């Protein structure tokens, strides 16, 4: 015979699951793993936007499914541990430049590529 | 580096791991011309001296 594809696992997903476990990091939109009936595509006349499956328009979006509000709050809790506290004495900019007269500026440039 | 892009993709074809539709096309045409007798003459040992 010819290997048949299993059904999408969105059906086995609980309407109350924790979504952050499904997409922990940035990953490309997978129709079989996202339980949303989302459609995209300029519709033909008397037609509907195209279904998620095989929809190359949805695969061209840089999606934010790995950064839901839930996920962010959870993430930032685990990261409060890493950050230290601003000197409460340095309330205003007046106080900043009283105690620290020099300011050093520098820029970092984030860009995609091998180098 | 055009020497690297052609030489890599040439071995990948000789290794069986890359299909070169263009080189397949040109091989077919070359094969047919040979049948018609329109084959490249041997260098030096040509019709002329």
């Amino acid at each position: 015979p010819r290997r048949k594809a299993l059904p999408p696992r969105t059906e086995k997903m609980a309407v109350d699951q924790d979504w952050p476990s499904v997409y922990p990091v940035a990953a490309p939109f997978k129709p079989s793993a996202v339980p949303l009936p989302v459609r995209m595509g300029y519709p033909v006349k008397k037609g509907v936007p195209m279904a998620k499956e095989g929809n190359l328009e949805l695969l061209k979006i840089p999606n934010f499914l790995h950064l839901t509000p839930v996920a962010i709050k959870k993430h930032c809790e685990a990261l409060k541990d890493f950050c230290t506290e601003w000197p409460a004495a340095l309330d205003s900019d007046e106080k900043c430049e009283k105690h620290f007269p020099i300011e050093i500026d520098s820029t970092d440039y984030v860009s995609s590529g091998p180098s | 580096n055009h020497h690297t892009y052609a030489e890599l993709m040439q071995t990948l074809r000789f290794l069986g791991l890359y299909r070169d539709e263009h080189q397949d096309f040109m091989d077919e045409q070359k094969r047919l011309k040979k049948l018609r007798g329109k084959e490249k003459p041997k260098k030096g040992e040509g019709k002329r001296a």
Binding site: L79, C83, T84, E85, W86 | -
Partner: protein
């Protein structure tokens, strides 16, 4: 994370340039292209290195 943050949109940049539309002649016919660069500045304030 308890950081003070303000956001504004710096105005966009649209870089356009023109090319010939045909391979050989027809100088009066061009294709024009652009690249939009959109911006958002996150102004964070009073942070420690960590």
């Amino acid at each position: 994370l308890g950081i003070s943050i303000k956001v504004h949109e710096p105005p966009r940049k649209i870089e356009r340039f023109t090319l010939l539309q045909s391979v050989h002649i027809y100088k009066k016919h061009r294709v024009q292209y652009e690249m939009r660069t959109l911006y958002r500045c996150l102004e964070l304030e009073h942070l420690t290195g960590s």
